[PDB]
Amino acid sequence: SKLPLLTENGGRVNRVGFTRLSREGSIHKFGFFYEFTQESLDFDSDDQLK
Amino acid sequence: PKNMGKTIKVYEYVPLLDDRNINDQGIDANGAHIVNGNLYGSSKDIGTIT
C-alpha cells in the first residue's frame, strides 16, 4: 500500500521527511567522611588505626 | 608511652621477711609443712626469731 510509486507525469508525489532526536546525561556529586579525636589515635590499642 | 592507654601499672615486690608475704609454700626447719610461707615475718620477739 505505502510503496513509493511513480507515474509518467512525474510531480509532487512521495514526499518524505526526517527527524533528529537527542539524548542527555547529567553529573552528580557524592561524598562522605568520618571524624576522630587525638585522644582516639594517641592512646589507642592499635598503632596504625589511621 | 602512646598507644598504650590511659592508666599505668607497676609491680611492688614484698621482701621475704614481711607480714604481707602471705603464701603457702613453706617448710619448717624439721622438714614438715607449715602454714606461713615466710620465715617469721616482721616480728621482733626473740623467741619467735630463734
Solved by what technique?
cryo-EM
Q: Positive or negative, the Cα torsion across B28, B33, B37, B40?
A: negative
This PDB structure is determined at a resolution in Å of 3.6
Residue B33 carries which DSSP code?
B
Torsional class of B25: left (φ above 0), alpha (ψ -120 to 50), beta (otherwise) = beta
CA angle B43, B44, B46 (to 5 degrees): 115
**B8 part of contact set with chain A, CB < 8 Å:** no
Which chain B residues contact residue A46 at CB under 8 A?
Answer: 3
**B4 part of contact set with chain A, CB < 8 Å:** yes
Q: Are the beta carbons of B41 and B18 closer than 8 angstroms?
A: yes
Q: Which residue of A has its CA nearest to B3?
A: A43
Instruction: Point out which residues pair with B27 in neighbouring strands.
Output: B33
Cell of A49: 588505626
**A43 part of contact set with chain B, CB < 8 Å:** yes
